């Protein structure tokens, strides 16, 4: 799952319990910017900043959509992070924690850790951050 | 506590009966129990999981579920009981946060779902999510 | 521990790791609210606006102290709870969670509930909130 | 339950095991940790209070774990918190197969051993890690 290689499938639950997948109507045919984080993980004022950022600017840009992925094991602990840090884009958690399947097959090392996945489900940048997930974003948005 | 032995209880239930797990509905199977109360049960997900669970293996012989209360006002108990449709067995001894129950299960904090085996070994703790209906499904 | 009984002992730390007792420097000789809680039992918006509006209230009075004793098992649950909430005044916890002695010692049956001690360590009201609670502090200092 | 064997080297490379010399035999605590996610310093300071009280106690051993992957912000963890104990990495992260055994699920986690390997209490923070060591040693 290095950049170029098809992102593994997944499909997790979000904060109704409803389950998401690439392929769901909010992400199918967009750049889909994974962010993997967890609660037990936070502070993380810099990344949330960036991420927060990138959300309020393309808000309204069609081909762009953004999802949290928690290593959470406990759904009170995940709520409370969403609800405090106003992590107001898509999360998924499926109280797995380090031993998350999604993470594994992602090959996420550490947290938090960004994936860009192309509109075609290709991985086009792995812990991407900073000014290098600004400037991607820009170039490619 | 995971491979020790689940501790005897005896706890009423709405009609206000005594329960053990060597009771007929609930012996030589799989038995999940989940430990809530009315007055800390800030996360609707937990009961709509244990929901779809019920409905799920409602047909299989080797598994029951049990909720036991930490509540200590029966109206407020039966009332949160009706409101989110907990139908499967329901007990509660009106201890609250002293409960013995809760301290020999080592239940720390609410909710807590514990599995038990047949024989009565504790399987799993504090599982949630993919860790709890996927644990269910290798089982059953 | 009903109404005019003493107080019993307790020695559990803060966020900074220090024991806090009753007879701290902080506490004695003052009418000590303590606030048992818990991050697992959250959200209370009622119960923390109105510790808030006290602590508030009061802050310049030297009669009066507050103290949180959270029931977390886990100290950034416990952490994250405090700031999320700004729960500003003293807080400890000794990471025992629901059957913490402390709890059990102050007969605590659910979560959130308030305990009103006097300068001498009697109690002066068990499970007192609300406007209940706004008026006997207003009657004390 | 018993505790799944692991090799992990520490600081200068050594691998070690629960049967290393310094360990059998003991009550043996695991803390496992990473610089990336160690938010709460009462962590480590507790932690610190416990080597130090029972550093003559022939009967007792801690072990750091930690998940790093990058061995400069391993050890400059180490030194920051001075990490005194044994420490142990082999950086592969959250894909650590030993955290995965010891079903370590988040970070910090302690998990106390008996001498023979027994998990005698796992994820005990503040008086539940201090009052069982207290009543064991």
Redo the contacts between chains.
């Keep these: 799952v290095t950049v170029g290689k098809s992102a593994p499938y997944f499909s997790l639950?979000n904060?109704?319990?409803e389950k998401l997948s690439r392929s769901a109507e909010r992400f199918r045919n967009r750049y889909l910017l994974l962010n993997f984080w967890?609660?037990?993980?936070?502070?993380q004022p810099e990344a949330n900043a960036e991420l927060k950022r990138l959300n309020k600017e393309y808000k309204k840009n069609k081909n762009f959509a953004m999802l949290g992925i928690s290593?959470d094991?406990?759904?009170?602990?995940w709520?409370?992070?969403i609800?405090?840090d106003t992590l107001s884009w898509d999360q998924v958690?499926?109280?797995?924690?380090?031993?998350s399947e999604t993470?594994?097959q992602y090959?996420?090392?550490?947290?938090p850790t960004n994936i860009l996945l192309s509109p075609t489900g290709k991985i086009l940048a792995r812990d991407i951050q900073g000014e290098a997930l600004t400037g991607k974003l820009k170039e490619l948005l």
């Design positions: 639950p904060e109704k319990g967890a609660s037990w993980c936070d502070p290593l094991i406990d759904r009170e602990a709520e409370t992070a609800k405090k958690c499926d109280f797995t924690g380090l031993s993470a594994k090959a996420i090392l550490t947290l």
